[PDB]
Amino acid sequence: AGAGFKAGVKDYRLTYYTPDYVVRDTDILAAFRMTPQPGVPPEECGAAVAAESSTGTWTTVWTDGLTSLDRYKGRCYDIEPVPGEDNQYIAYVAYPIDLFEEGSVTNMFTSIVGNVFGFKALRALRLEDLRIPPAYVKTFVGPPHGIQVERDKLNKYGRGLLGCTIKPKLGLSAKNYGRAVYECLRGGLDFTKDDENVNSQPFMRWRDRFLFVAEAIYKAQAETGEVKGH
Amino acid sequence: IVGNVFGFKALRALRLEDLRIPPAYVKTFVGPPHGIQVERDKLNKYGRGLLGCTIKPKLGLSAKNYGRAVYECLRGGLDFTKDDENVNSQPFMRWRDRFLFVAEAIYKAQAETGEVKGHYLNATAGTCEEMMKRAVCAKELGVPIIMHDYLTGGFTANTSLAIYCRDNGLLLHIHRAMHAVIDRQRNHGIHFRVLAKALRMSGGDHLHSGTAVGKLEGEREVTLGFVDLMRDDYVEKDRSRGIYFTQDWCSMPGVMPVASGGIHVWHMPALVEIFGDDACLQFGGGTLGHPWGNAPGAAANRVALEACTQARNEGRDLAREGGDVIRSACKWSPELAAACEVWKEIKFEFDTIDK
Amino acid sequence: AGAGFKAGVKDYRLTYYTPDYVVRDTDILAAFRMTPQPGVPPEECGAAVAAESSTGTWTTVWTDGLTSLDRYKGRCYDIEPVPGEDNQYIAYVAYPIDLFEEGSVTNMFTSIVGNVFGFKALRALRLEDLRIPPAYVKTFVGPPHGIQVERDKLNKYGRGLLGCTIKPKLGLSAKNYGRAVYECLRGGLDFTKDDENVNSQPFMRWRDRFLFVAEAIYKAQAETGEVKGHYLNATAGTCEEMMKRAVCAKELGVPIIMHDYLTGGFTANTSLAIYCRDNGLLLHIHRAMHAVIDRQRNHGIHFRVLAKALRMSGGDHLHSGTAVGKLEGEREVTLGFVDLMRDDYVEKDRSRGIYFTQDWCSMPGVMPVASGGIHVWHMPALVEIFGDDACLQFGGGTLGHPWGNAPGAAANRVALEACTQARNEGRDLAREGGDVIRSACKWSPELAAACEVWKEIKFEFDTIDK
Amino acid sequence: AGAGFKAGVKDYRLTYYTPDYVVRDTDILAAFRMTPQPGVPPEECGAAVAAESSTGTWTTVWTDGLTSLDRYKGRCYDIEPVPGEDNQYIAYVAYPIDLFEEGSVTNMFTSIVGNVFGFKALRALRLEDLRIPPAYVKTFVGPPHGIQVERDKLNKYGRGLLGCTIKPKLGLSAKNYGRAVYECLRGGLDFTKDDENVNSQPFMRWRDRFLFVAEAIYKAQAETGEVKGHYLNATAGTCEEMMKRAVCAKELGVPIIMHDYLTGGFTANTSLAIYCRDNGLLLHIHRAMHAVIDRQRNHGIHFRVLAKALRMSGGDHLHSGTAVGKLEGEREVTLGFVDLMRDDYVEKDRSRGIYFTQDWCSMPGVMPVASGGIHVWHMPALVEIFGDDACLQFGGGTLGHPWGNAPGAAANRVALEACTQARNEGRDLAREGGDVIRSACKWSPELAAACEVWKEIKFEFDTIDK
Amino acid sequence: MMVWTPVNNKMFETFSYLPPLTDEQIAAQVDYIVANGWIPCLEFAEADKAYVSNESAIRFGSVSCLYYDNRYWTMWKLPMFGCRDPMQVLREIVACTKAFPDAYVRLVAFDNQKQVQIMGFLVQRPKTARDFQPANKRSV
Ligand SMILES: O=C(O)[C@@](O)(COP(=O)(O)O)[C@H](O)[C@H](O)COP(=O)(O)O
Ligand SMILES: O=C(O)[C@@](O)(COP(=O)(O)O)[C@H](O)[C@H](O)COP(=O)(O)O
Ligand SMILES: O=C(O)[C@@](O)(COP(=O)(O)O)[C@H](O)[C@H](O)COP(=O)(O)O
Ligand SMILES: [Mg+2]
Ligand SMILES: [Mg+2]
Ligand SMILES: [Mg+2]
Ligand SMILES: [Mg+2]
């Protein structure tokens, strides 16, 4: 009789701690700064993070045998102690590219940072870095334009771009917003901007803002002879 | 409120503990598509907590095997099963294949048991357009419920989905994936009670609340506090439960709390005592980890829940007599006895961070 | 002064022949079988192919200096001599992944096979293989479902699938088409299909066919209690007409449509594959026109490349050839590309014409379909070649049965099941195949009648594509 | 008179070889260059091709009796031996018009070239020509505009059009692409174009290119006072993407887009041609991949058939080859298909490879485009071969000029106009071509520079497609 | 010419066109499962749930493509992971058929690498079934 289904709880490290694993160039890799609870070995904590962000749960399930756990499991493959810290470790986890929806940052986060930060067995957890392999990178549309194309479209080269957030953050009318934008742009700024929290509000509805801002951009552009934006 | 201030050099740490959302602002939101009362009415389920189950392994099962697991779980006595939060659409299982096989499973289990069944089909996607395509397919299959990861998908997408659910009569289950990144530490972040209020406003019929007793952290008093904030119409200030402000919901529907994560049959009395009937209790490992398989696993959980519910109704104190209630049910139900034996010694007891 | 612009013609090999280049794991690699004109060195010919399929033209251009030629150029990195040939070479070319549009088989072919086959400096050119790296594979939607999901949806396991093309190819009315379909499906075939050239014609308009075929599928399914399908042809003159046909199939609730991917084209095929994914239709792919391109040893594109292209563009089934039937296909070569169609990882194996290790990075496999001039006596050989993950199609071999379609279908189904059982019991179909069929004949009258009619019928000719 | 169904295999020639058949004026006719296997009679081989491209299969089917085989069957009606060949024949096959879907080139190819090229019983097969009858021609939308309308819209008369492919093929940014286009167009070229493989890539996304090219077109047009255009490539991975690109061109008000009709496919091409008709866009057709199919004498499909197919599917321009450039194309063969592309009625002429008289019944003509390894010294020969109704394209021959794009364009424009003037004045370009160019060189410094760089550059190799 | 009967001639996928499997033939199929390292499993269904049907499609929009009810049967216990003993499978067939004497019962096997069912055939039909023909009465 081969390996079969045995109900019950076993240590995560038996399946999910694989210190001799050689990472594949298609694997997504994560570096977690891990602070275990007293009495929890780093290997078990690292294994837990790998398991609960990939394929595993707290007790053994029979359905594992219908698939290939080896193919799909996240693997904690290295643990580094943190210099200057008594109870901090960097756990490295490798995830098969198969685990992820193509083109979906939402999915990537849901797996890697979905539940593991709330585990009782750890006191703290911080995701420090991710290695996104080319095979996964290529599934994304990515930036609409990027640095080179943006400079080319704006016809702006040889210096940093200059911008300005309109203030006060909230409280200005659409007309006064446009007035402030025009005066900023005409003096030599390339861009102005809505404050992050300026969306559409009783004091200034968005479409009113958009139109007055359009007038201001085109006024400043005509006056200076330089491409302007907000 | 939380846009830039957390990064100010002049502070070492900042945590948003609570928000008082006034009725005048509450009324501007569509809110939950249905809410607790309407959900019970649509499902025709009353007088006990709802029972659910996350299919495992989290990732790696084919669409056909997914549906197979779902059918076996539902037919044994669970009300719901669900996609794991990270099950979206992947090489091993594309979403539409899953939706169809799961539909077959739901309808088979429903015909077999004579009880309404559902499976939270995950609409979480990379784009709003993809998310909506998934919601539309669920609508066209006539199935009762979909799910969304509101923090990883985001509030903008969540609010859109909630509006779609209201307009098309789909229940919306909300998974709180990523919340502990934000809400775990006492000194910095945003407390879950704020994230829960935000979800009630954005819209969801269910929201994960934690278990207190399971594998993931959640202190009892704090949990009782935000469960009231999720379910009730009016919640008075109570600093002993972390409620900093009186909250008036001005008739916005309540959200069903969902207790999930490392729970099993022995936890049942404590769960029924903490949450009462207006909750969903979810057993992933606690069902698919049963030595006899999914249907007996589901039956064990269902027997445990009904035994505790009956005992409470008869005037028994689940806080003291809980162990006795389960032991009596074990001697009666072989399915339950098998579950009790496997997980008898399994507890999750650690020092609480979010005090 | 550094390197500047010098107008004029120079040898391609100065820029595009890089024998010391170490290929990157993201590079697309091509193996061309190249026959240079007299007096053209193989290195210059290989360099020319690399240049004119990537960044270069016949004379030096100043615009090169605005970009990085090193970053973008195709590179001829190896030239192998061909044993038995005095003027044939295998030129290996590496193309940076940056050269290609994500998700577009059309773009890949346009670069690699766009212009180089017409160069005066070569007498002949054949594309033998392409290494499609995982980073490029992942940009494609790929097959709507693939082998596993298809079996799961149909609820069919443990044997090859059986199919049948309705005959005569053209000339049957919609009603008679449906009648033939019903009779075939009810006798034991899983699928029937429109012939590749059955689209919409004066003798039978497509919507009439679709409806009668729907009636036939549902009748046969109710009668047998097994899931049935008929590949309804969506191949059309325009993308709009193609989509209208797919929509009708969806609205009828039928399981499967088909498309001629080479005659319809990759752009249309990819669109249809996406539609099929989004609406749960299986997609059968017919390779009409492939032999125009892939038959001759010295010139064209080997089918294995056309098969990789299809797997990327998207299809649930693809015709693979039979080896033993009326159409050409050598056994070893066929075994090679069948692995390329079905498997996740295929190691380099020159004895089966596999020039590069191919990693499919979990893209679903495509079901091979063996069709064309096959009959019951071929069954053991077919089961031995393909195994269970294949569809075997009998057009003439069903509608040519002396008792009609249902007995014809039953004969083929009995033959298939007898061979499958025999294999499972440990019998060697390569040696015992004749005995298996003879035993089944003595037992099944339907099978006996088929065996008698086609006993002496074989297709054995000298192979061109060696 | 009906006869009983008799199961079993019989010779194809019994049904499909009809040497006394008188072809109908509505029949589609095909001329196949056929190379049978040893021991296969030419009549049986021709009959097999007719059968398997129309109604027949390898064994007798009962369903034939429900229809009229006489009405629908393809017929091998004539077999010619090939002079100089021991085992090559021209088999003529007639197909009833009822066999074909109206307006669908895809369907026509699927029947005629779908399966027959792979038959074991033949060693090689080449489709040389097709007679498309008026009754079938009339079912096609055809070219969006055609030669006359294009000239009228552009306001360009009295000379060949001049164009240029931007180089390097791949690797330039959208901004640098537009910069190159502006400089080319302002110097005297009518058009520039995306290379066939320029679609949308990491180094340059399509919409960025479209916008910068729009700026360049409008700048050059204002500067010169002549109408300018740039063939923006709509070729894409899916029909949906292709259409998004065509729509953007429409919204920018630009005159012309391009499509790679063989790599994109006939279904996509026909849709794009229809879109172009409805929105007033000119459509330039690139023949990427044609030489995979049309290079070898013994096997494939001759370009003249691919050209007829394109005229039916729709295109305002089509690449025709140069004869004198870097890519193969024999003079006599080229003159033949150029007539087939441009003219209303083309008489049978075996000396130019025209097997059938072709009546286009007023379907608009397609402008031939000569491109590939040509430069100023080729100008006289090109003007002599094509006349005014052609576009001559100089990629390397413009961007390879020592002084840059604008002088390069000016040199080509001067050369063209000089040759045109000389022809008009009664000079014989075939003999006086060199003198015409030398005189223009002494006059134009831009042209003198071009003449010096490419003086010794010729492409003279043994012709494969004889 | 013989006529394939359309009346009460329901089939049951793989091997249903052959003579009914003998105990020896079943054992041979089980040996094949074990020899290839596949996972044996039994599934069963009452008569009303045995064949593909359409009833749930009443609830659908235009999404019935490749949807059928009754594809899923009910699992007997669990798949026999790690089973390398043909006698154990044969004993489970006996146990399943004893517990459900009026059910359809099929033996299946799974491949966990392809993750697909790789074999399957019927091992019991209810005695009350009258919607099928003996081999010698399939044609008339
Ligand atoms: O992925 C998981 O771990 C679970 O499916 C539980 O599985 P088990 O039932 O097998 O434990 C739930 O998503 C977590 O409980 C979410 O945590 P929370 O409810 O705290 O947000
Ligand atoms: O048109 C035909 O000839 C067929 O319908 C076979 O008919 P029969 O079953 O009557 O032979 C198939 O399309 C060819 O086999 C395709 O060839 P391939 O699979 O090689 O692409
Ligand atoms: O890619 C090229 O090589 C070209 O841009 C020519 O560049 P140059 O002007 O620099 O030579 C053309 O597409 C080919 O002529 C196409 O061949 P054909 O016209 O025979 O189809
Ligand atoms: Mg700000
Ligand atoms: Mg989960
Ligand atoms: Mg066919
Ligand atoms: Mg080109």
Would you say D273 and D315 are in contact if contact means Cβ atoms under 8 Å apart? yes
Q: How far apart are CA B280 and CA B290, in angstroms?
A: 20
Three-class secondary structure of residue E132 per DSSP: coil
Phi, psi of A124 (to 5 degrees): -165, 155
How many alpha carbons fall within 13 Å on the CB side of residue E81? 18
CATH topology of domain C14-140: Alpha-Beta Plaits (3.30.70)
Q: Would you mind telling me the total number of residues written for chain C in this entry? A: 466
Residue B156: partners with Cβ closer than 8 Å, 6 or more residues away: B128
CATH of residue E75 = 3.30.190.10
Strand order, beta sheet including A28-36: A75-81, A89-95, A28-36, A122-131
Report the 10 Å Cβ neighbour count for C421: 22
Place of tokens 């069902």: B287
| Amino acid of residue A94 | A
Catalytic residue among B148, B175, B191, B267: B175
What does the DSSP 8-state code read for residue C16?
H
Would you say A53 and A12 are in contact if contact means Cβ atoms under 8 Å apart? no
Catalytic residue among A10, A167, A175, A219: A167
**Nearest-Cα residue of chain C relative to residue D453:** C8
Q: What is the number of domains present in chain E? A: 1
Would you say D85 and D34 are in contact if contact means Cβ atoms under 8 Å apart? no
Residue D8: partners with Cβ closer than 8 Å, 6 or more residues away: C400, C453, C454, D59, D60
Residues of D in contact with C95 (CB under 8 A): none
- Ligand 5 mean position, distance from CA B139 (Å): 23
**Level-2 CATH architecture, domain D141-454:** Alpha-Beta Barrel (3.20)
| Amino acid of residue C135 | A
- List residues near ligand 1 (CB under 6 A): A 52, 57-58, 115, 118; B 54, 56, 84-85, 176, 208, 210, 215-216, 260-262, 282-286
Does B touch D (3+ CB pairs < 8 Å)? no
Strands of C57-193, DSSP E:
75-81, 89-95, 122-131, 161-163, 191-193
The H-or-E segment that residue E43 falls in is strand E39-45
Does D touch E (3+ CB pairs < 8 Å)? no
D205·A149 Cβ contact <8 A:
yes
E72·B103 Cβ contact <8 A:
no
Q: How far apart are CA C356 and CA D413, in angstroms?
A: 48
Would you say C121 and C58 are in contact if contact means Cβ atoms under 8 Å apart? no
Would you say B70 and B93 are in contact if contact means Cβ atoms under 8 Å apart? no
- Mind giving me the DSSP string for D117-157? GGBTTEEEEEEEEEE--HHHHTT----SS-HHHHHHHHT--
Phi, psi of A25 (to 5 degrees): -70, -10
Which among A114, A113, A109, A145 has a CA at the least distance from the CA of A33? A113
A149·D174 Cβ contact <8 A:
yes
Q: How far apart are CA D54 and CA E99, in angstroms?
A: 59
Place of tokens 């005095």: C86
Q: Which region, left, alpha or beta, applies to residue C126 given φ > 0 means left and ψ of -120 to 50 means alpha?
A: beta
> Which structure tokens are listed for B24?
């005048």
Residues of D in contact with C58 (CB under 8 A): 326, 372-373, 396
Q: β-strand E39-45 against C256-260: which pairing, if any?
A: unpaired
Place of tokens 């779980």: B73
**Nearest-Cα residue of chain B relative to residue C142:** B91
Would you say D322 and D373 are in contact if contact means Cβ atoms under 8 Å apart? yes
Phi, psi of C130 (to 5 degrees): -135, 135
The H-or-E segment that residue B51 falls in is strand B50-52
Atom 12 (ligand 3): residue with closest C-alpha? D372
Gapped junctions in chain A, after residues (C–N > 2.5 Å): none
To 10 degrees, the CA torsion angle through C52, C57, C59, C61?
A: -140
Given the candidates 3.30.70.360, 3.20.20.110, 3.40.50.720, 1.10.540.10, the CATH classification of the domain at B30-343 is: 3.20.20.110
Rounded to an integer, what is the distance from CA C68 to the centroid of its chain? Answer: 37
Which among B169, B93, B163 has a CA at the least distance from the CA of B128? B163
Phi, psi of B158 (to 5 degrees): -60, -45
How many alpha carbons fall within 13 Å on the CB side of residue B252? 32
| Amino acid of residue D185 | L
E4·C446 Cβ contact <8 A:
yes
Residue D196 known to bind ligand: yes
Would you say D53 and D117 are in contact if contact means Cβ atoms under 8 Å apart? no
Report the 10 Å Cβ neighbour count for B198: 16
Q: How far apart are CA A89 and CA A122, in angstroms?
A: 11
Report the 10 Å Cβ neighbour count for B12: 8
- Ligand 4 mean position, distance from CA B187 (Å): 24
Would you say C326 and D119 are in contact if contact means Cβ atoms under 8 Å apart? yes
- Radius of gyration, alpha carbons of chain E: 17
Strand order, beta sheet including C75-81: C75-81, C89-95, C28-36, C122-131, C300-301
Would you say B199 and B183 are in contact if contact means Cβ atoms under 8 Å apart? no
E17·C446 Cβ contact <8 A:
no
The H-or-E segment that residue C36 falls in is strand C28-36
User: B52 - beta bridge partners?
Assistant: B282
Q: How far apart are CA B129 and CA C218, in angstroms?
A: 35
Phi, psi of B298 (to 5 degrees): -60, -45
Q: How far apart are CA C73 and CA D282, in angstroms?
A: 32
- List residues near ligand 2 (CB under 6 A): C 165, 167, 195-196, 287, 319, 321, 327, 371-373, 393-397; D 52, 57-58, 115, 118
Residue A166: partners with Cβ closer than 8 Å, 6 or more residues away: A172, A177, A180, A181, A184, A192, A193, A194, A195, A198
C18 to each of C51, C56, C73, C75, how far by Cα in Å? 12, 15, 11, 6
What does the DSSP 8-state code read for residue D186?
H
E67·B108 Cβ contact <8 A:
no
What does the DSSP 8-state code read for residue C204?
B
Q: Which chains touch A (3 or more CB pairs under 8 A)?
A: B, C, D, E
Strands of chain A, DSSP E:
28-36, 75-81, 89-95, 122-131
Whether residue B191 lies in the annotated active site: no
Q: How far apart are the first and last CA of chain D?
A: 48
Three-class secondary structure of residue D283 per DSSP: strand
Report the 10 Å Cβ neighbour count for C413: 23
Resolution to 1 decimal place, in Å: 1.8
Would you say C172 and C208 are in contact if contact means Cβ atoms under 8 Å apart? no
- Ligand 4 mean position, distance from CA A181 (Å): 15
Q: How far apart are the first and last CA of chain E?
A: 9
Interface test with E, best of B75, B94, B97, B100 (most E CBs within 10 A): B100
Residue B106: partners with Cβ closer than 8 Å, 6 or more residues away: B70, B74, B117, B118, B119, B143
Three-class secondary structure of residue A229 per DSSP: strand
> Which structure tokens are listed for B227?
């469960």
Q: Is the peptide bond before B33 cis (omega within 30 degrees of 0)?
A: no
Residue B221: partners with Cβ closer than 8 Å, 6 or more residues away: B240, B241, B242
Domain boundaries, chain C: 14-140, 141-454
Q: How far apart are CA D21 and CA D39, in angstroms?
A: 26
